[PDB]
Amino acid sequence: ANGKITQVIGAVVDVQFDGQLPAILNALETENNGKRLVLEVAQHLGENTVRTIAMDATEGLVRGLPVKDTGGPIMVPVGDATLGRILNVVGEPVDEGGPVEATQTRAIHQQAPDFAAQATASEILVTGIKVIDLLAPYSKGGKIGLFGGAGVGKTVLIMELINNIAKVHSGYSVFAGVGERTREGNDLYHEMVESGVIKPDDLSKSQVALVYGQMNEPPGARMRVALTGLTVAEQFRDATGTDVLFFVDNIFRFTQAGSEVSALLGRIPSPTLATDMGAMQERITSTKNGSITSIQAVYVPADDLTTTFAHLDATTVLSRAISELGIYPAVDPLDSNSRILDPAVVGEEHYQVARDVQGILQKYKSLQDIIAILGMDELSEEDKLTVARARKIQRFLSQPFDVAKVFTGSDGVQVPLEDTIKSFKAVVAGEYDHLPEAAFYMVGGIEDVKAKAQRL
Amino acid sequence: EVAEVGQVLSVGDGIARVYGLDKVQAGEMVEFPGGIRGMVLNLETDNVGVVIFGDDRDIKEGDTVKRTGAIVEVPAGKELLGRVVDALGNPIDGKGPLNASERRIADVKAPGIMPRKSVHEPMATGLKSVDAMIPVGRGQRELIIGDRQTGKTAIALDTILNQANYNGREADGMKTLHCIYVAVGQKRSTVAQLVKKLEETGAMAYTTVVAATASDPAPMQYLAPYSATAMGEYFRDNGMDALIIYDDLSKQAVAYRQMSLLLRRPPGREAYPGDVFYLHSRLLERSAKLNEANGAGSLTALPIIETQAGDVSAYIPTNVISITDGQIFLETELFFQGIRPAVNTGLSVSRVGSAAQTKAMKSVAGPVKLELAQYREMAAFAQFGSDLDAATQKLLNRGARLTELMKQPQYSPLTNAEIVIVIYAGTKGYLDGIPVRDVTKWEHGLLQYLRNQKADLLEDMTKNDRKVAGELEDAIKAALDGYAKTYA
Numbered sequence: 001a002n003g004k005i006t007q008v009i010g011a012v013v014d015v016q017f018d019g020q021l022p023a024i025l026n027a028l029e030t031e032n033n034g035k036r037l038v039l040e041v042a043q044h045l046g047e048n049t050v051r052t053i054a055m056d057a058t059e060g061l062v063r064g065l066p067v068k069d070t071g072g073p074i075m076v077p078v079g080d081a082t083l084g085r086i087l088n089v090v091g092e093p094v095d096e097g098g099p100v101e102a103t104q105t106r107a108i109h110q111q112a113p114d115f116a117a118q119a120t121a122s123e124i125l126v127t128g129i130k131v132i133d134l135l136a137p138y139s140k141g142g143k144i145g146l147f148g149g150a151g152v153g154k155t156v157l158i159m160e161l162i163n164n165i166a167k168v169h170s171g172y173s174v175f176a177g178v179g180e181r182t183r184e185g186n187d188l189y190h191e192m193v194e195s196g197v198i199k200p201d202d203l204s205k206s207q208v209a210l211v212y213g214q215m216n217e218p219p220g221a222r223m224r225v226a227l228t229g230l231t232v233a234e235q236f237r238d239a240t241g242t243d244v245l246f247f248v249d250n251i252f253r254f255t256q257a258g259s260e261v262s263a264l265l266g267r268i269p270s271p272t273l274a275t276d277m278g279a280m281q282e283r284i285t286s287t288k289n290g291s292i293t294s295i296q297a298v299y300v301p302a303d304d305l306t307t308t309f310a311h312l313d314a315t316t317v318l319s320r321a322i323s324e325l326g327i328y329p330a331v332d333p334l335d336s337n338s339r340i341l342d343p344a345v346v347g348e349e350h351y352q353v354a355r356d357v358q359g360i361l362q363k364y365k366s367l368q369d370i371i372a373i374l375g376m377d378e379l380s381e382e383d384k385l386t387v388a389r390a391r392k393i394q395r396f397l398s399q400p401f402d403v404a405k406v407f408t409g410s411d412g413v414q415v416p417l418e419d420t421i422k423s424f425k426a427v428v429a430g431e432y433d434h435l436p437e438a439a440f441y442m443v444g445g446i447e448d449v450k451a452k453a454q455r456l
Numbered sequence: 457e458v459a460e461v462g463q464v465l466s467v468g469d470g471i472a473r474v475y476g477l478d479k480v481q482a483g484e485m486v487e488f489p490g491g492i493r494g495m496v497l498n499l500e501t502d503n504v505g506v507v508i509f510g511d512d513r514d515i516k517e518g519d520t521v522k523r524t525g526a527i528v529e530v531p532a533g534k535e536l537l538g539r540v541v542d543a544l545g546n547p548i549d550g551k552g553p554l555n556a557s558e559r560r561i562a563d564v565k566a567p568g569i570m571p572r573k574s575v576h577e578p579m580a581t582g583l584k585s586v587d588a589m590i591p592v593g594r595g596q597r598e599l600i601i602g603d604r605q606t607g608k609t610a611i612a613l614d615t616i617l618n619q620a621n622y623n624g625r626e627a628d629g630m631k632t633l634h635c636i637y638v639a640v641g642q643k644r645s646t647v648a649q650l651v652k653k654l655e656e657t658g659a660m661a662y663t664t665v666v667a668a669t670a671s672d673p674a675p676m677q678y679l680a681p682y683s684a685t686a687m688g689e690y691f692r693d694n695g696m697d698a699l700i701i702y703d704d705l706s707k708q709a710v711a712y713r714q715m716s717l718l719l720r721r722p723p724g725r726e727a728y729p730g731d732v733f734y735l736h737s738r739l740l741e742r743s744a745k746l747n748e749a750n751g752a753g754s755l756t757a758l759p760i761i762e763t764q765a766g767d768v769s770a771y772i773p774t775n776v777i778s779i780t781d782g783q784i785f786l787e788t789e790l791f792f793q794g795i796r797p798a799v800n801t802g803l804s805v806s807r808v809g810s811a812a813q814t815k816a817m818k819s820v821a822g823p824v825k826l827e828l829a830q831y832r833e834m835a836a837f838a839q840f841g842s843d844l845d846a847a848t849q850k851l852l853n854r855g856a857r858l859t860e861l862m863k864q865p866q867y868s869p870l871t872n873a874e875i876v877i878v879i880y881a882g883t884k885g886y887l888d889g890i891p892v893r894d895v896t897k898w899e900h901g902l903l904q905y906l907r908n909q910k911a912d913l914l915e916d917m918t919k920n921d922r923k924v925a926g927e928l929e930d931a932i933k934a935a936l937d938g939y940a941k942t943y944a
Contacts, residue, residue: 008499059483216566216741263730266722301778
């Protein structure tokens, strides 16, 4: 039944078998000085020997050690027990929080959803965040790209997306940390604790499950850790039928790790490098029984300094310029865009209001140098009016977040999709030219603007 | 026999194929006849590939290879302070045995997510450029990157020499920073000169040098960074602070590439092994800041990379940039012009930022990197000789003086308090009426004036760290006014 180790070449481990030969992608187990070591089957070499990639360090392995074929691929814990925990690639807890007492387990490698039960036509995923839903709406089963440097509220945005999908859709979230700095992995965890998306004292009520395979881990771990995260997300979709988020920081590292593994198995080496997912892409989709939406933190080795589509359905561009005007979240309302920002998907009203808002902000940007150098009196009467609406709209795109409440004190808000469309439509038409600019700053929908206006 | 012992089939270029050794584990140390050590990297069906740490010309086909039964480990502790050792921890300074009371595995897994704490404490290089614009904190990893002869080694050595001003003060809320210099692929003479500087200044007292020189075999160059990190981890794990300098990791990667290809492992990108990123990432992940529950100790890393013709887009540079918490890019064009330290303000950054600075430093240093990056951009524009308005001229005049203020010779680090006042002076217009020629002269006199005439102000800033505002700002303004009258 069992096999034995014949060779060890770094992460590459060869295992000769007697009985049934393990299929490709099967998890094997072996004891490396007491502690168990998982190995994943890559090739069949002949002479009844398989060629595997290790999921941990191989130092201390001896030739002749017995190896068990598990029968299927790498299995990991799933369900509510993962909420608020940090797991490694093979489903072990790396947060020092004791055992993950889950009832079910699921394989990390899984065939894609077929054409039957795939949801017909593209469909909006309401985040409740005005700027996103209006100007660059996310799609269910879509590939979303978050762009931004440091100090533009990228982590705060991610956590509010986690928050909002839990609040407005009764959904779940999974964050896959892939080949990034453990220092920053620590910071992200404690930032999530601060704002209540992870609740140490009541973990099942946490809004996100973490899966970490950072820089310290070997190629095999960093290659598969994203799939471990996706499998946890898939369980939340299947069990509850809700809309699930799968955060990946980041795809460049996923590809980098996969490239390392390919090179180690003896393959010759030779824009989309940052955003292109593998066969993983097919598992990100919208079905009749819920959806998984990929939110990826877009990264290349551009750690020196702080562009178009590739494999993405929408982009959220965070901007330092927008952040310095006091607009939170710091989303660029012109550089952010969506494939479903199209009347056939979101409706004629949604599209037209978004287009008008963009037109007003674009025109305002064209008159920016004139307003800075000369007065507002320099403009014609027609252009003076559009600037007033643009300045209101800029502030009206800003929004308070539930996640920010611990720092600021102010309550957060999720704005319904229709409230967002109607409120901005009214402002574009000029129904609220009489209200002050400060009323539009840091509020929900148009009824909050009216309430804030009466206070002033 | 066969299980615990083997026979050498072939040997050469620091590598040996060995028959037998059936029960030898991967990464295990092995003994050759004449006391020569080696590490097993390849376990194959019909042989065992060994990388040789000693001299390979002695070994001959037929010799007996013996198991140690242990993974490659090295000595550690305060006994290594003052000493120069090789990659396995054997002393090479002729000062007798080490007599260590502890031993640690060289290549180990870095601490996980939970035991860490956010980096919040200064790791002062003593250089105005770095400490003000690209501040390094305790537990941070900060790459130093650039061509040959851009001053990379000199920045690292100045950092070690600077610690004497803050070391041995286990009383005033000041942990000693213990230093670990790793020479990888340098000439024996270059290391000897560096050690000679450490000893004559007294900085050797708190420093350990680990040397795998150009003449030492490739497996020692590969290992030295890991072994030295283990020596640094003694301090980190027992409530103490340490600094480690990898000089340099380009040669460790070159060494790793040679060993791997000689073991008949496949080539990856640029012929380096497929996991060459992992080589450096697992190393640098071990530098960290631990929380109070784990003793609050720290290991800070200054890894060095050598670029070719300023090519920071190259493979190994791209890897280490993606590992560390920012970089200090030293540029040839700046170095050629006598702008030293040759800090490219646009490409250099510290991800930790203000958290790695004092309250005093933070309050004045904020806008300095942007202003100097903008200045250099404007000076480049000025070369064309189109019209420069009065506002542009005012920035060029200011930035030219700030450039001179950021110049700093070797072996001349300034304290935190001293840099704060120099930065304040530049940014607040105190050098505007002084020619560009005489700025470094003006600074040299100021430091002597401050050290002689206002030592009480410098000691007050050090111990009672505050932002430069209110009363402290009046003391600094008065100090600069006082100095301005002597210079006139």
